[model samples]
Target: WDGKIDGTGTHAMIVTQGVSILENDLSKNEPESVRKNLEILKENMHELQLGSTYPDYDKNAYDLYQDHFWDPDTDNNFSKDNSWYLAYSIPDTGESQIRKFSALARYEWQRGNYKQATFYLGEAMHYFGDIDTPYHPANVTAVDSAGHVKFETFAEERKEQYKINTVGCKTNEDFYADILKNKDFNAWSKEYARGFAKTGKSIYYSHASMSHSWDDWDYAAKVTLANSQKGTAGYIYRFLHDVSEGNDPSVGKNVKELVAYISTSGEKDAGTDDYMYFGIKTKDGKTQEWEMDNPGNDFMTGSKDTYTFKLKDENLKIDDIQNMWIRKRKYTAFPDAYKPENIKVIANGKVVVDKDINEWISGNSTYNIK
Candidate 1:
């Protein structure tokens, strides 16, 4: 990320989604520039979820680390980035902090601050777009639940590029089926095994480094998170296990950092909205307004949102059709929380996009056309 095209495609995409043309050279390390952005964003993001969504963030370290296989050394440390944290820790269930940025962008736009609105919306869209990447969610769930447990239940055959399974626990449904009766023993044995497997790809990008939380992952957050699981959660898990064996207990204030060493639950859904953009180009080389049969006036029609202007008339002949993305809305339809069934483009009732919408904007959220 320190220059050398750390992430090429996404970077290029974001280079174009703009209020002002992005200089070919642009870099942001929120892990500085926007260190206070999250808190600033929360002020507005919280309101966006007033009625519909509610993401119940972990109340204490116990609720946070329950299923995550908690350890003290890595997270309990006084560093904000190193410790696993829910990007959106307030709502009981709704969207993630990513969408908050987008929602705030709309708020700014509603207030007629087009400049700042696009910035926040783009910032929100950036993260919404990030989750679609392989490196983004390259790991498993928070709590080892029904659909989740089978994921990280490791074995030798499961071993691949890196991340060797350490805990001598059994793998697959056979192990899970045996201990459903004993919730206590089941939780213990699972993390007991995952503790050792925390490695190059524990539950995060490049390695097990993200096993803690998404907020603590990414190149932007790189300063706070350790690239190596061994240095982060791996060692911490070992140390905590050893200490727990000896009943090492201390207050969070005294220790400066402490996880209650309990398993949390549920997969925190990354937030996003449902709006893609497009435009039309006339034969004379004049670009028309944003389309798609969506109703709107100047601000919505002018600034961005022109990307989704669908070709409505059969006789509306044009030299070429173009898709240029701009700000998005419709709360749940954004790409991060994208669903294949949610996509439908029809001319004469025939579907336009046959597959998932994610296949289109599969990068850092920028000037993408479809």
Candidate 2:
């Protein structure tokens, strides 16, 4: 009889009975119901047994036993090891009950009630996996559209921002199955929540402090995405660098140079094409060529400049070079002839050179002719 509301109880009973029949040690016991549903199960089992007739009965009793408690095809009758009853019952709801169930099931299986023992042990394993995931509780509400944010939207945005794909598990079952395959339930749950929380934070900061304008939001999203990709790439780069250590230039040195370049140039403009390249120094002491092609004409134009470095050694691998050119300009310009009066210098706690005093300093200073 299919009495389990969920599959757990039915599965338990099938596994228990299969074990019991294999072990040839099924035992007879009066059914005990834990609740209304269980009571119904007990009644059905009792009715089936009664229908089979009392002991000293005929073929009907034999058939009844075969259908419910034994397998006539296998010629296995109900004994401590052969009854299917254990397979259908779940462990009672207390910790003690589970422990007792484990002990009893193990003993019964060892003594020949393989089905019951197997079912109970399997159920325990299943339950343990279910409870282990930290975010399993969140899954209960995952499908609900109210409190939970749309995972697809968040995931898509992340992918677009980070230039990577990470979507998985369209359904709960698919998700749980993937989780089981890749991680323990608890750890998987924690990771799942962590991902969502991170996405939420990204969205929050994008809107909160960044002015909430479309351009600002896009800029924030792009930055967040690039950072994530860079982090992932960094790990891979480190691994590769480790493998090639000593054979080539130290990857750490290369990375340090790259980091320095990025630190100098990363904030130059918001466009993707603006980047830095590294190269070896020429024998003449020119370490690396710092070239920014089509540099930003003006700040208001928001144009991106392309920077390229011509390595002194044509054979030099990009992975080996330690210095790079930044797209950013390093030179500063003071006022020229016409605006020279607007320039002032306050030094050593005194107005050493006022804007109006440019004539006096011009002879002592350097000024470009406009």
Candidate 3:
């Protein structure tokens, strides 16, 4: 369910062709930049991942009970806004973004702003893509958190195992309609749109533990196929919705103009969502931790800023550090397994995160935390 995999693993390039590409085969009536950006959006849509929130990064199971699982009132709007993508584990959200992001994508599409619309639509794709991941499924948890990480890593390592689109429908409309009938957003919305009307719906007690998950090769194939279907449907829905309105978003935008696009290196946390930070303590017990720099948006690697407080004194040395706890905003099952790198206790001459930690030392490729 995620192209969010290691830059190039699971996106629907096969299905992507079914979406915005026009009569010239690849070229389109839309401005060049619009098409270009739209393509980039579809390819990199998984850049936006949701898992935790500002508040309740400290809340316990009960709070999560209402927020992550279900809230009868208002259908958990705030929780959805601030919580994880709950489709896999809880089957619901505080507020679901499937409709919201899509609607905005439609608005942007109608404006003939294909590029801008691409981002909005792509985010909608992101939300839809998440649920199908076995790691993110409705019945998995912490002990299996390692499996979740492993699943993504495995997919990235074994890229040739799946295809993007299984349905061979001719038009975007055909594929989209096929999508609504087959699985994901269109079908899920019919019953759970406002969330379960009765009480048991929010309860996570059914499996007590998710009995079936990605460990089986059978289920793994299912995950890939399910994600392929769900992801493709979403892409078609957003693309068609825009063309239905038929406006030139490029009308007033600088569609013809362009610039170099190198934002954040496209690096994102593939599996876990524990908002991480480090504690740098001094000899006298004076300590500093990071402050959140970006709050409202979803995170990418190094995206959420838990900033450093100024040292207790400028002359402090690395030896002065008395204690360091790898801390996170939330107590997730996957915490220690996916601790952030780039950590350092720095000064004019002092260093912490080994500067040598590069591609070779980067991500825990074949390992995890001790």
Candidate 4:
């Protein structure tokens, strides 16, 4: 580990190396603009790494933000004390801070502030790089610990020898949707922290000789470095791609399947007896109203489920979709009332509609969503 004041410390170097790895793994399908921007970003990785490290070295930031650590070994750590910072004066396990900065990046981007947006995103990326370190999320403090410093120093030196890999998204729409979900932002980072923390605990707390053995440490450091690089690439790609796209609705042209995820909420008897039907209308015409059959008896209260309907024509385009509708006819009684907590529709992995509809629909009513 470099001194607190060093700008080209371990974090910055990892991000810059990751950017180089991403360029090497470039796909022919990637947009030209994205590549160009990444080139520029590669030059800025050193500055961006500061976003993650600033909290540790800056006096004001250190007081405001809790230490960038999340110990999964502690039973109630995340539940009891986890938050973004001490602005609320509570402790954080580092998860919420990542989530906060990620959302902030998107917010600034949407507000037409690219510089500020990337700064926040860069900060988020720094935290992502940190969580993979066995020491960052563990009880061991890097300040004076021998094993902590040795592990980081080993990674910084040997990172180039490791293979960095990334999972390709099916479409830009798929990429954008995954970013919007922010599931990986929270879930993946937490799990990675837990895993690396476990490794740090086992080896660092064991025999003195094993703890100091470079071979034993190399096994863990390689995985950490690879994961850090992969995560860095992902963060850069998602943000740069998003900035270039500007939420362009015209991008998702390929469409093969239409899917709906429905969640039933409200009182105990909020379920409906009437069968539900769905339909999609495009520029040419409307697809035949398709029945949404559930394996269960009916739409039961407190039920969360997903239903998918494949388009008969594989050539269908998502942009051509004009409107989508969901209908439930009055079967026998007074228009049965069914409550839905939320309804989300996906067209070939792109979220077409995501509405928090806490309303109740009654009778032969149809809700048309665009």
Give the winner by TM-score.
4
- Candidate 3 lDDT by residue in tens digits, 54-127: 11232222332222222334444233433434211212342244444444555555556655555555445443
Kindly list the per-residue Cα lDDT of model 2 for residues 236-353, writing each as its tens digit. Answer: 1221221222111222222211111011112222222222222333334456433332222211112211111223344443334332222222233432111112222211111112
Alpha-carbon error at 281 in model 4, in Å?
40
lDDT tens readout by residue for model 1, 266-354:
22332223443333344545553331222122112112211112233444421233342333344343344311112222221111222
What is the full ranking by TM-score, best candidate first?
Answer: 4, 3, 1, 2
Cα distance off (Å), candidate 3, residue 303: 11
Instruction: Evaluate model 2: give its lDDT.
Output: 0.27
TM-score of 4: 0.50
* Two-way TM-score contest, 1 vs 2, winner: 1
lDDT of 4 by residue, 265-358 (tens): 8577777778788788888886646677634344678765445566767777777778887888877767788888877676532356767777
Q: What TM-score number comes out for model 3?
A: 0.39
TM-score for each model: 0.20, 0.17, 0.39, 0.50
Error of 2 at 223 (Å): 24
Q: Over the full model, what C-alpha lDDT does candidate 3 score relative to the true structure?
A: 0.37
How many Å off is the CA of 294 in candidate 1? 39
